[PDB]
Design a protein around this ligand. Structure first.
Ligand SMILES: CCC1=C(C)/C(=C/C2=NC(=C\c3[nH]c(/C=C4\NC(=O)[C@H](C)[C@H]4CC)c(C)c3CCC(=O)O)/C(CCC(=O)O)=C2C)NC1=O
Ligand SMILES: CCC1=C(C)/C(=C/C2=NC(=C\c3[nH]c(/C=C4\NC(=O)[C@H](C)[C@H]4CC)c(C)c3CCC(=O)O)/C(CCC(=O)O)=C2C)NC1=O
Ligand SMILES: CCC1=C(C)/C(=C/C2=NC(=C\c3[nH]c(/C=C4\NC(=O)[C@H](C)[C@H]4CC)c(C)c3CCC(=O)O)/C(CCC(=O)O)=C2C)NC1=O
Ligand SMILES: CCC1=C(C)/C(=C/C2=NC(=C\c3[nH]c(/C=C4\NC(=O)[C@H](C)[C@H]4CC)c(C)c3CCC(=O)O)/C(CCC(=O)O)=C2C)NC1=O
Ligand SMILES: CCC1=C(C)/C(=C/C2=NC(=C\c3[nH]c(/C=C4\NC(=O)[C@H](C)[C@H]4CC)c(C)c3CCC(=O)O)/C(CCC(=O)O)=C2C)NC1=O
Ligand SMILES: CCC1=C(C)/C(=C/C2=NC(=C\c3[nH]c(/C=C4\NC(=O)[C@H](C)[C@H]4CC)c(C)c3CCC(=O)O)/C(CCC(=O)O)=C2C)NC1=O
Ligand SMILES: CCC1=C(C)/C(=C/C2=NC(=C\c3[nH]c(/C=C4\NC(=O)[C@H](C)[C@H]4CC)c(C)c3CCC(=O)O)/C(CCC(=O)O)=C2C)NC1=O
Ligand SMILES: CCC1=C(C)/C(=C/C2=NC(=C\c3[nH]c(/C=C4\NC(=O)[C@H](C)[C@H]4CC)c(C)c3CCC(=O)O)/C(CCC(=O)O)=C2C)NC1=O
Lengths: 161, 30, 192, 160, 161, 160, 161, 160, 160, 161, 160
């Protein structure tokens, strides 16, 4: 994986360049937002379970999805689905701390679209589950962090569609 | 010309398109 | 409405058993369990070899509790009977993922691993590669000293569930291992 | 069924069914018309065993229908009585199948994780399931009541 | 896999239906034939080797198939072929006990047509090997079981062609 | 037995015996009294079954009692009937337990290797067993004769 | 393992004896208790967690064992201990169904004394945990089954001491 | 191309092109870079696609490589794969242009008459093309594999 | 061959050939012309060899060619000599290869299962091979007869 | 795999033919060149490392390939590349000893073109690395063996392009 | 030896030795007296050989014997020739064994780690061995010199 800082280091390493003014400006733009990323992660982590619960309630359950014939019918599959939800939330929190989406590609999106096609897992319904968790997250983390958390949820959801 | 396509007489690990030319058939004799 | 069969099956948890062995505990039970090692490790889908490769002295070592199931599996991995039939005919890249599955029940994880095993097959050969796996963290937690390995379909690494579904129980073994007499192919029919 | 369980063992050992396995399929199928008849009594009274269960459940543990209770309110209760209706249905399935395969995939594997999420109190639920045994069992002959009772006690067993 | 008892349950579960009269009638139709299925399996199992021998003798050997250039030439391939035959016989016996062909799809037919195309294995000749084992089986198991055993051999053979 | 087989599978999934893997045991218990009775009946006529099996065998396969035959001579024939007495005994064991279990460990696992060493023609041992089925079966009621017959056909099957 | 019935079969097999009359008395007894052993087994199963929540209460917790310095201190070890308890209960239920203690030797007692010495697990305290579960079991199963269940708990406990 | 097709329709009407046609051209230009890339990828694996197509073909239709078959023999088979190489080439041309255009003039108009003369079974040539689709398609991403697949199915269509 | 065997061991240990492996290739190839002469002589007398083996066989085992014998009759005997012709051929292959790889894949791996199905007595096939050794060996110089004899005794060994 | 000799044996085995004059002539044509193949292998093996170093020096390094942005930039990738080179050299030595290219297909070329496309490994540059090792080899092994070694390097390189 | 290597492969596949394995033991043992003569000659000239290798080495690499060289000085040079004496000894062992088992366990497995620790330049040890080949080879007949040379080139190979 890479973060903001190693994204820059590797981009310069392939050119064998010492870090110059443009590089140093990018890294500053990361460091200057760093404390806010940490606070936001502590809110998400400590509200993890409630975010999933409120996101499922707005976007998944009370529906045909949870009824016989639906993909989140059976305690087995309901458990698998909210298990997935926890992955998304947790990794988006990593991406936002790192200030780089590369981890969402390497460890979450790669092959996932076809995995879901192969099992029958409804893609559009999963995206709504992602964009509902974003909605909840953006309330809990506040002005400071709302836009920055949000983008990695949006990265996740356009990665499936 | 058809020289590139020619070395395709090797077929696969073991795939020859059908019937191995003349094939001895000893059952009459036995 | 979708039935219980629609998502991730329901026929695969039934079909995966965990056999352990119980040192002081019946030949028949031992046998079935022993037979499953052969079925997972060297493919043997019919679950038993016509008194072949097998394990003269290998069976007595595993029973007697002189050797433990993990160990017996490791012996089985590096042997002629195995080298021929799974490494005799394949470039350096599909034999690695085949050694992976039988012993880890899957496919290669990422591109960074198509490196760890290809270099071990590069330089230390096949025997070292077999040992590398039987001693990894993943092998150990899942089947440890005494669980006979089984197919897995694991959820987690991303992409690995569908790769696993495809490598095992979706795509079988092609290619005859020996190179002795090619099958001719012009004769599908048996008329008489 | 007994079959789904009696074949899986065959295939896993790469073999045809044993005399034993064949015998139990035999004895099982002979008990078909009768097992069908025990599962018809229970569908007759489907909503009445459930209502009666609901009451017993709440005497033995009411707090669930109280201010800070998971089943507090008319529609939080409608859901609870509905889950009791679900499990009675699965019990009728199990009785006609002669084992739990169906009961298990539909309503116990994953049930801990489901209910932990909902923070429904699961252990109260086992008692609720137990109450249905008491009602259902009072509508069946001694012999049929026992045969039914095994499947109720299974769910009670899993569930926790 | 599924069997007649299990299929009735999963077919109703996806509709969330209690077993009703129609369901109960189907299950009876299975149970009422059950003892006969068991007896038939014990005949097949205990005559396994003779059935293969007589089926090969009527439909495979004494032919170009066993001669040089033929797919069951070499002790290696002759062994592989009668090994296959044993699979078919054994699984058909499972399908007939279960009263459901689903196992023949899951564990035998899936990919097999193309596997045989890829190795060069003659499909038509293999079908005759299946329909010869059926012929032998139908004699050995008797009036009681003949039709019921037969169908899963016919399932196998239209699965390849 | 049926018990041993059920239990061994149970401990294997870290689970409790379920409502199916109880029904078979119940069937077996009722069956066992009948099963015990059949074994006793078979035991009573053992000498007649063996002897008449031995005549039926040597007509059908006179080659084994001929110059180059494994059972050629008076004491090569005496041991042959003794082996037929062994297998009838194991068949009574199998019937009574309700599961073949012990017979396998006692007389089929290793039997190929034993007889190959002695150079005994295995398929003619299978014939000797069919011959015993025919005799034993003529001393039992239709229903009991079938129940016995499954165990005879198993041994015939395992020598294969 | 062996049960009542296979205990007899193997004892005669080594002598190559057909089952004789006294032996047959012994099998008659096992079929006589077969109903009660099954009804009784069921009761234990669904009430298991309740049962186990009474043996610990009267023989393990509220003590130095659960306090710092005690072997069932830490949620880890408390969990391991009641996990063990479930093994004992479950296997004793197997032994009692089989009417033979051989499974308690093969799969529970073998090496366990020294395993407990090596970890420091208090043996005497574990025996009390066994004899408390017996006490509870004997109430729940009733006159019919009390003595028969009890013996395999007593087998377990003299196997450790 | 897409250009040629749009223009020819424009000129026939003798009026400058109009917004739409233009939109298609714009789509094609963006598509062309991707289209050019797919053709290059197909070109790289040509020998593998042809050879594996040729095996897939002769399994599915062994009659063409048999006594009375059009492709019977080593050099009647060599020309057959060469024809398969021809059509893969034309498929790369079709993909890149964005319109089939040139491929039609090069290899379908007149193809019935050519092959009828040579007595080549046309529908088994269509099979050889399906076989190439299967191989080529396994070397391309889902999106690019579909885009390629349209041109394979066209050729299959035109030999009909 | 000797080459295949040496190399496979080399590649499997990820290494170049040993001095030993190189030496045996050298000694082997030096015996090339001699090994080719041994195969020629035997190829040249093939029809004589199988028969004299066939006479030696039927004296020693007149039963195989008797009522209940696998080779009883004119065409059950014709196939039997044809199998003897097969194995002599494989023996010529082995001699020119300098090991059994070819002999093994073609005619011993699977041979137990094949002949068990056909119910052919394996040890009398081993006798037919000894009989061929005796004939073939009488048409070769002492040194060449020994070199040939190793391959005959191998086949005799593998049918065991 | 197959060599000269087994190539002939398997070609005749599928026809069930004893080796005839044409076959015997082919095998002679192999045996008669055998001693020279061995000497050539001993030169290659014992100069292995020097051949790679001189081949890399003429065809790979001192270039953009070894600079940032190049595929053999980083000690990791430089090591992987000359590791590959050793494979090629070693297997070509096997092919030349066997007098058959079949091993180069089975254990080296199969899937390698696409493997290199997937990693980004430059194919044309790798071919030059092969044809440079051939150049060095042909000097070291001498008149006797030059043409025979050369062909399996040429087999390798038209296998990638 | 050749014996050890053959046997270990035999035992590991649970089988008797192959015709091939038997043949190489025979060819090997026939070369016994010759191999013993090759070892004797070289043992008889050991002091001369090590020295001429040592001169050839220090001309080609005067640096090793230079300020920052591993073998710089009189006693850093004395140990260096002693190591050259060690390897010549192991080469005589290998020649009489007919393979490297002994040479390998005694002086190549672990040699990288040993010399890396001592900071000895490995490739110049390989040169010292080539130098010994040159001297030793000049005291042997053409045929014996080649046979010896394989073992020298092996050691040169293993230090790599
Ligand atoms: C670490 C990164 C990672 C992810 C994200 C991941 C996802 C993933 N989801 C899976 C299944 C699943 N995923 C879902 C998800 C859902 N069901 C619905 O209806 C909703 C639309 C959705 C939840 C919002 C369900 C129901 C299954 C089970 C399918 C089956 O029954 O086989 C599986 C198959 C293996 C398994 O069942 O565990 C994987 C691997 N695996 C990973 O390694
Ligand atoms: C490779 C070297 C090697 C040897 C030699 C070996 C011997 C050996 N013999 C064993 C058992 C045995 N060995 C025998 C041997 C005999 N019975 C008799 O009455 C005779 C006196 C004797 C034959 C002459 C028997 C009957 C058993 C089975 C004991 C049991 O039932 O557990 C076992 C226990 C595991 C098993 O049953 O296979 C081993 C390991 N194991 C090895 O790895
Ligand atoms: C036994 C037969 C066999 C072969 C031949 C083989 C090749 C092979 N080369 C690889 C990578 C590679 N191959 C190269 C090769 C080169 N880089 C360049 O720029 C040059 C053009 C070229 C050297 C001349 C490089 C740089 C990589 C690493 C790619 C990466 O970073 O992932 C990999 C991926 C796994 C790994 O990294 O080890 C394989 C499997 N594998 C095998 O099993
Ligand atoms: C067949 C397998 C299966 C089961 C069992 C299942 C249960 C299930 N129970 C639910 C809700 C519920 N279930 C209950 C149940 C209870 N409340 C209590 O306090 C009591 C302890 C208990 C009644 C005995 C309640 C109150 C809700 C509403 C919770 C909410 O909306 O937040 C929901 C979400 C609503 C919906 O979309 O249907 C599901 C999916 N789903 C399944 O697929
Ligand atoms: C090259 C590898 C190879 C071998 C060896 C081989 C043997 C072989 N032997 C056969 C039959 C037979 N083989 C024999 C041979 C014998 N009868 C005896 O009693 C003697 C012990 C023995 C002669 C020495 C007989 C009698 C049959 C006819 C059996 C029958 O038709 O049931 C058949 C079936 C007939 C056919 O379709 O050809 C095959 C395939 N097939 C192969 O691919
Ligand atoms: C458990 C379900 C299952 C089935 C059914 C199965 C079939 C199967 N048959 C195979 C080969 C084969 N199958 C045959 C079959 C025949 N040859 C003939 O000429 C006849 C027409 C026919 C017998 C009637 C032969 C000869 C081969 C060997 C092909 C080769 O040489 O590679 C292979 C390739 C691997 C191997 O050689 O074992 C598989 C997987 N595999 C499975 O896992
Ligand atoms: C350091 C790791 C560690 C922990 C945490 C631990 C907890 C622990 N809590 C206990 C009891 C208890 N714990 C509680 C706690 C609560 N009751 C409630 O309703 C609340 C949810 C909660 C307070 C926040 C209660 C009420 C008991 C008594 C239960 C009984 O006696 O049945 C006991 C048994 C009594 C004893 O022997 O000490 C242990 C061992 N033991 C450990 O080794
Ligand atoms: C960023 C990671 C990285 C490194 C470090 C790297 C080193 C590197 N050093 C090289 C050569 C060299 N490097 C040295 C270095 C030294 N000579 C000595 O004696 C000293 C011990 C040492 C200087 C401190 C020398 C002398 C050469 C020329 C060797 C030759 O041409 O044979 C070359 C081949 C020439 C080229 O094509 O560039 C590379 C690739 N490449 C990389 O990608």
């Amino acid at each position: 994986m890479q973060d903001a800082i190693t994204a820059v280091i590797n981009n310069y390493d392939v050119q064998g360049k010492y870090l110059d003014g443009a590089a140093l400006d990018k890294l500053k733009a990361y460091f200057t937002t760093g404390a806010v990323r940490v606070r936001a992660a502590a809110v998400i982590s400590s509200n993890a379970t409630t975010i999933i619960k409120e996101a499922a309630a707005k976007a998944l359950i009370y529906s045909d999805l949870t009824r016989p014939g639906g993909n989140m019918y059976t305690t087995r599959r309901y458990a698998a689905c909210i298990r997935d939800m926890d992955y998304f939330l947790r990794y988006a929190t990593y991406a936002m701390l790192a200030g780089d989406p590369s981890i969402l590609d390497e460890r979450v999106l790669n092959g996932l679209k076809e995995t879901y096609n192969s099992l029958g897992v409804p893609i559009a319904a999963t995206v709504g589950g992602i964009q509902a968790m974003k909605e909840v997250v953006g309330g809990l983390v506040g002005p400071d962090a709302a836009k920055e958390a949000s983008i990695y949820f949006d990265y996740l959801s356009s990665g499936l569609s | 010309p058809t020289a590139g396509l020619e070395p395709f007489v090797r077929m696969s690990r073991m795939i020859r398109s059908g019937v191995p030319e003349d094939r001895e058939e000893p059952d009459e004799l036995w | 409405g979708q039935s219980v069969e629609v998502g991730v099956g329901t026929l695969r948890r039934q079909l995966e058993h965990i056999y352990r062995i119980a040192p002081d505990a019946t030949r028949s039970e031992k046998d079935v369990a022993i037979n499953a090692i052969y079925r997972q490790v060297l493919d043997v889908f019919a679950g038993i070899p016509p008194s072949y490769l097998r394990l003269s002295e290998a069976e007595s070592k595993l029973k007697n509790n002189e050797i433990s199931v993990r160990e017996f599996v490791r012996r089985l991995g590096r042997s002629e009977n195995y080298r021929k039939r799974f490494f005799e005919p394949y470039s350096s890249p599909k034999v690695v993922e085949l050694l992976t599955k039988h012993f880890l029940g899957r496919a290669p994880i990422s591109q960074q691993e198509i490196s760890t095993y290809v270099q071990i097959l590069g330089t230390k050969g096949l025997a070292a590669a077999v040992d590398a796996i039987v001693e990894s963290p993943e092998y150990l937690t899942i089947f440890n000293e005494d669980i006979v390995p089984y197919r897995r379909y694991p959820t987690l690494p991303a992409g690995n569930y569908r790769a696993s579904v495809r490598v095992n129980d979706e795509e079988l073994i092609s290619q005859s291992w020996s190179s002795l007499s090619p099958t001719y192919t012009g004769y599908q029919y048996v008329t008489r | 069924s007994v079959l789904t369980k009696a074949i899986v063992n065959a295939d896993a050992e790469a073999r045809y069914l044993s005399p034993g396995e064949l015998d139990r399929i035999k004895s099982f199928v002979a008990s078909g018309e009768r097992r069908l008849r025990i599962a018809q009594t229970l569908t007759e009274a489907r909503e009445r065993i459930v209502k009666q269960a609901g009451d017993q459940l709440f005497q033995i543990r009411p707090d669930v229908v109280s201010p800070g209770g998971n089943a507090y309110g008319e529609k939080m209760t409608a859901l609870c009585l509905r889950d009791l209706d679900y499990y009675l249905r699965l019990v009728t399935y199990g009785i006609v199948a002669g084992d739990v395969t169906p009961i298990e995939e539909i309503g116990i594997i994953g049930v801990k994780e489901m209910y932990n999420s909902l923070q429904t109190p699961i252990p109260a639920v086992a008692e609720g399931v137990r109450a249905m045994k008491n009602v259902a069992t009072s509508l069946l002959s001694g012999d049929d009541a026992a045969e039914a009772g095994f499947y109720f006690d299974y769910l009670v067993g899993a569930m926790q």
